[PDB]
Subunit: 309 residues, 2 copies
């Protein structure tokens, strides 16, 4: 029975699993009136990846493939991007997954860079031509259809985008308008429901809330202090995936500890499904030292009563 374990990296040493950003703080909040069902950042404590989760940090909310033309006829700023899997191989729309690995899992206008490196070398050259432009992938568009193998990608530039291999590097959001981090996009477009989903997560013990790892997400414009929350850091996913330690119950009692002073600061439940709950109500700040990290202490039963945070 290989023992379960969690990384000893601090908050300040880890990366958000739902967007390639540093983790700025721990954060909790009531979620009784919404459905927390992210598809990136999903891993069981036994190392099973779920949803669209993959292990390469800069590929989170990235897209890869080629531009094949404009999307439609009536907007010169809109391009049809046929997408592949991150490894460059064809994606099978009938695969029992929501969309290609690392596809964005929220509703919003994602800002980043469209770059291209030509597949062919021109006469008189020794190397392929390149170009890049700022761009937006609107996951609420009816042409956001990654499960079918394509997305519409928009530019402010209106001509210098070729029918060439294309990558989208995510940077942030175009604005806070229409951003809802817990609303899954329609991976197959309009009037088609999503499939292959990692399940929703929620606390059940009275007075518990989900604990999130929160990152502030850049905005291209608008007023806001937008953030995106993940259930576990990307480094925890990489760790569980490698360790594949059996879970002895469905609940791991974990403690947040200051390694210098040895002081345990609070306790929490790491659920087998891959999320944390704490005995906390409200959204007030979580005040913890910088050198702190979670330590696995024991497997407990569903009803273990946590010390209130």
């Amino acid at each position: 029975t290989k023992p379960f374990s969690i990384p000893i990296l601090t908050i300040g040493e880890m990366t958000n699993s739902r967007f390639p950003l540093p983790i700025d703080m721990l954060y909790t909040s009531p979620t009784e009136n919404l459905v927390v069902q992210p598809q990136n950042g999903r891993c069981t404590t036994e190392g099973e990846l779920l949803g669209t989760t993959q292990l390469v940090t800069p590929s989170i909310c990235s897209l890869r493939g080629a531009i094949t033309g404009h999307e439609g006829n009536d907007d010169d700023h809109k391009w049809h991007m046929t997408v592949t899997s991150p490894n460059g191989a064809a994606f099978d729309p009938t695969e029992d997954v929501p969309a290609p690995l690392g596809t964005p899992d929220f509703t919003g206008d994602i800002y980043g860079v469209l770059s291209q490196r030509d597949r062919n070398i021109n006469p008189g050259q020794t190397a392929p031509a390149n170009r890049a432009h700022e761009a937006v992938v609107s996951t609420r568009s009816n042409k956001f259809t990654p499960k079918l193998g394509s997305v519409m990608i928009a530019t402010w530039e209106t001509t210098d985008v070729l029918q060439q291999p294309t990558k989208f590097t995510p940077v942030g959001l175009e604005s806070p308008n229409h951003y809802n981090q817990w609303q899954l996009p329609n991976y197959s477009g309009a009037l088609t429901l999503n499939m292959g989903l990692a399940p929703s997560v929620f606390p059940t013990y009275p007075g518990e809330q989900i604990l999130f790892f929160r990152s502030f997400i850049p905005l291209k414009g608008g007023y806001g202090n937008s953030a995106i929350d993940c259930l576990v850091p990307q480094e925890w996913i990489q760790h569980f995936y490698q360790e594949s330690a059996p879970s002895q119950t469905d609940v791991a009692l974990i403690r947040y500890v200051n390694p210098e002073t040895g002081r345990v600061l609070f306790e929490a439940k790491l659920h087998r499904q891959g999320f944390i709950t704490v005995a906390k109500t409200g959204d007030s700040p979580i005040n913890v030292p910088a050198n702190g990290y979670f330590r696995f202490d024991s497997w407990v039963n569903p009803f273990y009563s946590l010390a209130p945070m």
Copy 2:
């Protein structure tokens, strides 16, 4: 005496430690005419970080701080960025490091996005304003002085940059002009030498070359198939940092294994200083399965004779 170990993640599951990119291939080449002295991606096999190396993947080649105004009075595209440490805290120019952690470690015109979130809320508003623009940090500029707490950052945008907290998210290179991945920038500007450096690395056993983890790096324009090479993946750095396993000799014999068939494909030396050498000459392609990873097998004496790849 804690045993040394290497992650079991495959090349296609890890990240470049010198730029936030997936790893595309293993790569070797002669370096007899170069000085290989990167400052990101530097970790001893005992977990000692060196140079400018830090653990947050999207912070590699990033810069944080605030714009104070234009750089000079003659180009409204050029801005003076005061730089902080990645945690937002003041950087001390006298600390025994080359530059703030994560600072770029090569010569080139680094392309990315400059984003800002205002520090105050304006009257009539409830949230701070935001803006972001394509930007270039030229590390060959005499105004690239991160060890002194500032860099010049340029935007195609001419005015919509304020004197506000600022992040630079790296995406790729503006072009291949003057890109030299092994030429350190002058962290303190002109006529001042760098200090606090992680040491240069080179093979010494006859017929050995350095083995690199190679990523293709996007280009905003120009002709080229530009790449950037790191000495070990970012996930190896995170692993060694946490494990802190003592190094029993200066050289770890490691084997690239196919986990499925269990077959060992080739062998290599992981040096305590934190780089890999192999018995290979030239730059011809390294042909290995997708599911392959390096496994630590034993500690060996200096000048151990490897099987030729």
